[PDB]
């Protein structure tokens, strides 16, 4: 999404349930691999936040 082509919006968004596995990105998808600071990238698929 190119809507947030600025710095003031911030999109003010919240997620209710995110149960998308990390390995699903290999199903012919062209999405860049997630990079996480302070925690290993796979922690999204392992633990809760």
């Amino acid at each position, epitope marked *: 999404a190119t809507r947030f082509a600025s710095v003031y919006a911030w999109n003010r968004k919240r997620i209710s349930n995110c149960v998308a596995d990390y390995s699903v990105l290999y199903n012919s998808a062209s999405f860049s*691999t997630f*990079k*996480c*600071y*302070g*925690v*290993s*990238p*796979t922690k999204l698929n392992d633990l809760c936040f």
Partner: nanobody, 126 residues
Framework: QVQLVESGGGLVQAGGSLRLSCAVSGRTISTFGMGWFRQAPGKEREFVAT????????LYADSVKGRFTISRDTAKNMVFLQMNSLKIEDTALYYC???????????????????WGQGTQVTVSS
């Protein structure tokens, strides 16, 4: 100015294999997170690869995706980067992962690390 010391350097045979390990101990990569990056001739910065604690998937750089490999050991407490199928274009200074500001994490961006001190000069030619 002082320059970072890394294993290797000098002329490297094309298509060979070499190891890249940091030698300095004042600012180890572990403090800022294990990783490696190289500066191409001029003022261009790029990322090569890094090893994640999971050990199941390694963050690969699109430029060298599927080329470089990293070995892992339980008690060595060190990370060694191994290069495969070297090319003439690989000629570039190699730097140890260091950040100008305090931070910790894993990432796959070219501008992840940068420092004033120059790195080991590696020349690759046929």
């Amino acid at each position: 100015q002082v320059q970072l010391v890394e294993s290797g350097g000098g002329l490297v045979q094309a298509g060979g294999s070499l190891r890249l390990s940091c030698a300095v101990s004042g600012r180890t990569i572990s403090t800022f997170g294990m990783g490696w990056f190289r500066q191409a001739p001029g003022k261009e910065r790029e990322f090569v690869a890094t090893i994640t604690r999971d050990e199941d998937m390694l963050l690969y750089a699109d430029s060298v995706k599927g080329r470089f490999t990293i070995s892992r050991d339980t008690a060595k407490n060190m990370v060694f980067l191994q290069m495969n199928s070297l090319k003439i274009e690989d000629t570039a200074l190699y730097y140890c992962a260091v950040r100008r500001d305090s931070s910790w994490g894993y990432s796959r961006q070219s501008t992840e690390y940068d420092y004033w001190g120059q790195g080991t000069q590696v020349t690759v030619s046929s």
